[PDB]
Design a binder for this molecule. Sequence first.
Ligand SMILES: CN(C)c1cc(-c2ccncc2)c(-c2cccc3ccccc23)nn1
Ligand SMILES: Fc1ccc(-c2n[nH]cc2-c2ccncc2)cc1
Ligand SMILES: Fc1ccc(-c2n[nH]cc2-c2ccncc2)cc1
Length: 339
Amino acid sequence: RPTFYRQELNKTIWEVPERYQNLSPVGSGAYGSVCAAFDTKTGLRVAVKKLSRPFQSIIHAKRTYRELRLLKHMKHENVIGLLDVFTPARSLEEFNDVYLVTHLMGADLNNIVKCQKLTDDHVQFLIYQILRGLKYIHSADIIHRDLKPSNLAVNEDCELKILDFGLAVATRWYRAPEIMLNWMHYNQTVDIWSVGCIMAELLTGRTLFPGTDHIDQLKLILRLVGTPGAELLKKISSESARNYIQSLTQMPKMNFANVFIGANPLAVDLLEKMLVLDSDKRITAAQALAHAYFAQYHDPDDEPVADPYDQSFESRDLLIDEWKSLTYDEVISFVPPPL
Ligand SMILES: CN(C)c1cc(-c2ccncc2)c(-c2cccc3ccccc23)nn1
Ligand SMILES: Fc1ccc(-c2n[nH]cc2-c2ccncc2)cc1
Ligand SMILES: Fc1ccc(-c2n[nH]cc2-c2ccncc2)cc1
């Protein structure tokens, strides 16, 4: 067991191993707080996240377990992974805090773009990387569900990593129309919709669908891609949703070539394949990587898939101490990567 030291940064108490030095606050969210630090063992700048109230309830306890299990499984260049996970506790009985450590990333895509058009080479490279990560995540039967610029970490070398996947600027702006409609059987291509929205924004410098609420969001979407055709209407079970949808003034799909005129025609073609209303007809991450737009980056021998990921715990109804003990087990069993 390493030697820990304690300090207060903002209102939060940080108790970490002495290997981590020079902690300085970087951000805060509902799920936890983050500090930048220097890892003396590796010479790397790292980000350290202290989870907030991880075992306050069964809900929080299961979430904490879900997050740790997911992060321990993600091992890919374009997905955030773990360098370390620790707790100051020396036994299960005093286990109350969980800290996660990863490579410090400089900014998010939102901050990077702020707020102009990127060059076509940068769009190619950033989107390629999102898709490469997404192929990996999807191969493990994981749906991200909340892909947006603020969940994409990017360094000054344009290296990109997907953050907080499978843990489920307004989020609704990047959400698939079937999610606005509350379809309970949406699939992994909801993530491809989000990528299409991100890509459009990198090309134009403007949010593609800046909806003010869920109904407005769906309206803006249909304005561009058109109201649903016959084949898609057949797939909608809900009578109320069909009545609503069929009662909108019908609109044809816009010509993407004109909407995004000036962009690389290959980028336009790919956007057309990503922003398809019927999710069953959207391009997959694997297919997208093979699209001619990424000719300069695609290497089928270096776009790996993930090891199988067991999410059976999601259907379990356990006690708060049981989720806590499983989490403790996952902390103790952690093996750091080669480095
Ligand atoms: C913007 N969000 C939601 C972030 C951003 C970061 C982050 C990551 C790397 N560099 C800077 C900030 C982390 C985060 C921060 C610290 C450790 C983490 C460990 C695993 C996963 C995420 C971690 N968590 N959430
Ligand atoms: F964005 C959305 C989300 C949900 C709906 C919807 N599903 N079933 C019924 C409705 C609906 C919503 C508003 N007005 C009439 C009907 C309509 C639009
Ligand atoms: F207006 C719309 C917008 C999107 C959808 C949609 N696209 N892919 C799947 C669906 C869908 C939505 C509701 N129920 C089944 C399927 C259906 C109607």
